[PDB]
Amino acid sequence: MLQLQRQKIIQDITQQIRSTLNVNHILATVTQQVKELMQVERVIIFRLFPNGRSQIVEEVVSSEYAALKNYHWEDEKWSQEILDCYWQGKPRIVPDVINDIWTSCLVEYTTQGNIQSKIVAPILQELGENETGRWVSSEHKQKLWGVLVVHACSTKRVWEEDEAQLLQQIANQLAIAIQQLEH
């Protein structure tokens, strides 16, 4: 009978509960908006895992440049002078990725991605109590889950402070979204 129609909404209802409740769906929609908003050729979420590993877990590329999605690496060491900047919740404006001495090893990554300038925006976690790893601060009582990055690839773009300011605002909004959705 039309008991058929009862489930045509139950599958909807479940579909939304699962949709909204999974982290990637809202990661994937924020980045698709950061991209269309800042008119930037690529938006990635570089995720850092405390064992050392790290991976671009979401990405929104203009079709012109490579899918750095899933791009990854193990035992990721960042320059101390840079994590300080990042634990303080401060974005990082890299107006010339090419001569950026802190990213002087992501030359492979830089040239395939074809990145000219970029803004890097920490995603932080107030993780109190007990957890220790590679991306964690005791001075700041905060953990660095990953990084929202935005890639100027077509031109060496110059960034206004409000651009970084803004990306950081959005990053700091993900931070809250992610702390909830980790099971």
Ligand X SMILES: *[C@@H](C)[C@H]1/C(=C/c2[nH]c(/C=C3N=C(/C=C4\NC(=O)C(CC)=C4C)C(C)=C\3CCC(=O)O)c(CCC(=O)O)c2C)NC(=O)[C@@H]1C
Q: What angle do CA 92, 93, 99 make, to 5 degrees?
A: 110
Q: Which stretch binds a second copy (CB under 8 A): 88-96, 134-142, 144-152, 162-170?
A: 162-170
Whose tokens are 């899933």? That residue is 70
CA separation for the pair 147, 121 (Å, rounded): 5
- Stated as kind and residue range, the H or E segment containing 56 is strand 54-61
Which of 112, 173 has the CB closer to a second copy?
A: 173
Residue 141 assigned to a binding site: no
Residue 169 binds which entry of a second copy, ligand X, none, CB below 5-8 Å type-dependent: a second copy
- 34: nearest Cα among 121, 155, 143, 138: 121
Cα-atom radius of gyration of the chain, to the nearest Å? Answer: 18
Contact between 32 and a second copy per CB under 8 A: no
Which of 5, 80 has the CB closer to ligand X?
A: 80
Question: How many beta carbons lie within 10 A of that of residue 107, not counting itself?
Answer: 11
Contact between 176 and a second copy per CB under 8 A: yes
Scan residues 88-147 and list those touching ligand X (CB under 6 A). Answer: 92, 94, 102-106, 108-109, 118, 120, 147
Pick the binder of a second copy from 2, 3, 75, 114 (CB under 8 A). Answer: 3
Contact between 130 and a second copy per CB under 8 A: no
Please list, residue by residue across 85-100, b when 16 or more beta carbons sit within 10 angstroms of its beta carbon and e when fewer do: bbbebebbbbeebeeb
Whose tokens are 């990084």? That residue is 147
Q: Which stretch binds ligand X (CB under 6 A): 2-10, 20-28, 72-80, 130-138?
A: 72-80
Tokens of 8: 């045509």
Query: Which residues are annotated binding-site positions?
Result: 46, 76-78, 86, 92, 103, 105, 109, 118, 151
Residues in contact with a second copy by the rule CB under 8 A: 3, 6-7, 9-10, 12-14, 16-17, 20-21, 26, 29-30, 33, 37, 162, 166, 169-170, 173-174, 176-177, 180-181, 183
